[PDB]
Amino acid sequence: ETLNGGITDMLTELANFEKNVSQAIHKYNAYRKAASVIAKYPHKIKSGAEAKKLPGVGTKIAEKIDEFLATGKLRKLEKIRQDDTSSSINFLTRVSGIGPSAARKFVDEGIKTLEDLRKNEDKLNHHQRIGLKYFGDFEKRIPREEMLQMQDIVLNEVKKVDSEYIATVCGSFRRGAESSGDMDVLLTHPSFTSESTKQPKLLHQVVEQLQKVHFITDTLSKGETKFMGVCQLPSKNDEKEYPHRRIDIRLIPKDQYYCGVLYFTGSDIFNKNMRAHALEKGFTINEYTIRPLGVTGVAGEPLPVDSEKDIFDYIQWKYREPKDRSE
DNA sequence: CATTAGA
DNA sequence: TCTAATG
Ligand SMILES: [Mn+2]
Ligand SMILES: [Mn+2]
Ligand SMILES: [Mn+2]
């Protein structure tokens, strides 16, 4: 957590690079398991040799650790950090729509900067187009204050279109966070669950709503179950407009909400841990259900849920307010 | 780890 | 169809 820090971070830098600037899936995969194990080991690695004892630790990375231990740095690391191309790739990457594949291609074409991308708006797609559009506000955090404002309007039309809806705005917001990166809207409807062969419109009706009122402003992607967009809060009585916000709305079978709710609400750890416990408790939890375990090794059969509580009662735990689902 | 775009 | 990019 800290006695093995420099090593871990260095490695992951090492790993993140192979994946991105290069295509080295494997090396990258390499640096990761290593960067993983070395993180677990309870003592101060004092030499590669020592590291090397480890699993996934080869001559390659161990060599790497000596150098880092020996001298406060690493050239390979220093070289990359300098490398304009590779820099370039990391950069373009921030552009929502942009991935490594693109990055690279873009770079090869010579598009390396913000401006580059502009000049060639043609070379980019709608997503990427949008991404480029709202790059600044896309990297901006969302104050709860706003979060509050957003969730309000949203439940608002949700309600309006059909009173039979259920929306929850999950994530850290849901968890109390003083700020969020985007807004995550979970959605369901009685008239939609497991078997009841859809009602795409169900999703459809809302986005449309939000749009008509100006909440929704662009479309990153619209599917019959997962919309992905951009939104904004009505820029008040002037002098202050709002940044373009990333938002996601998703449809869900009323029969699997709460799990998914539970889940997407986190925290990553809270979940893992709760889930771990459900294992002892003779259960199985996952993004959609909760199945009781059969000693044969495994089992099935989706226990019925109607609330965040049921899942809890099931594994006989303490209801944790989402406030404190921190871990 | 599944959904969406796209080419 | 595949492949990329999001989460
Ligand atoms: Mn070994
Ligand atoms: Mn990006
Ligand atoms: Mn998200």
Element at A69 (helix H, strand E): helix A59-70
| Contact, A96 CB vs strand C, < 7 Å | yes
| Triad A284, A286, A290: Cα angle to 5° | 45
Burial of A318 (0-12, 13-18, 19+ CB in 10 A): exposed
Closest CA to A124 of A94, A91, A88, A98: A98
Contact partners, residue A36, CB within 8 Å, separation at least 6:
A56
Q: How far apart are CA A21 and CA A88, in angstroms?
A: 9
Strand B contact set, beta carbon < 7 A: A 125-127, 221-226
CA of A38 to the centre of ligand 1 (A): 12
Which candidate, A122, A138, A116, places its Cα nearest to that of A231?
A: A138
Q: How far is the CA of A93 from the centre of ligand 3 (A)?
A: 17
Long-range CB contacts for residues A7-13, cutoff 8 Å, separation at least 24: A7/A35, A7/A38, A7/A45, A7/A51, A7/A65, A7/A68, A8/A35, A8/A38, A8/A39, A10/A64, A10/A68, A10/A74, A10/A77, A11/A35, A11/A38, A11/A61, A11/A64, A13/A77, A13/A80
Phi-psi category of residue A73: left, alpha or beta, with phi > 0 → left and psi -120 to 50 → alpha: beta
A64 catalytic residue (yes or no):
yes
CA A267 to C1' C3, whole Å: 31
CA–C1' A278–B1 (A): 22
Query: How far is A196 from A310, CA to CA, in rounded Å?
Result: 23
A123 CA → ligand 1 middle, Å: 47
Cα(A323)–Cα(A125) distance, integer angstroms:
39
Distance, CA of A125 to C1' of B6, in Å: 10
A279: Cβ–Cβ under 8 A, 6 or more apart, which residues? A293
A255 vs A40, A134, A273, A290, CA distance in Å? 39, 36, 24, 11
Q: Which domains does chain A have, with CATH numbers?
A: 1-83 (1.10.150.110), 84-140 (1.10.150.20), 141-263 (3.30.460.10), 264-326 (3.30.210.10)
The single residue listed with the structure tokens 């999950």 is A170
Resolution (angstroms) stands at 3.3
Burial class (CB in 10 A: 0-12, 13-18, 19+), A221: exposed
Residue A225 to residue A186: CA distance in whole angstroms: 11
Q: Which of A64, A112, A123, A323 is catalytic?
A: A64
Q: Which ligand is nearest to the CA of A250?
A: 3
Query: Which residues in A97-244 belong to E strands, given as ranges?
Result: 142-143, 166-170, 179-180, 183-189, 216-222, 226-231
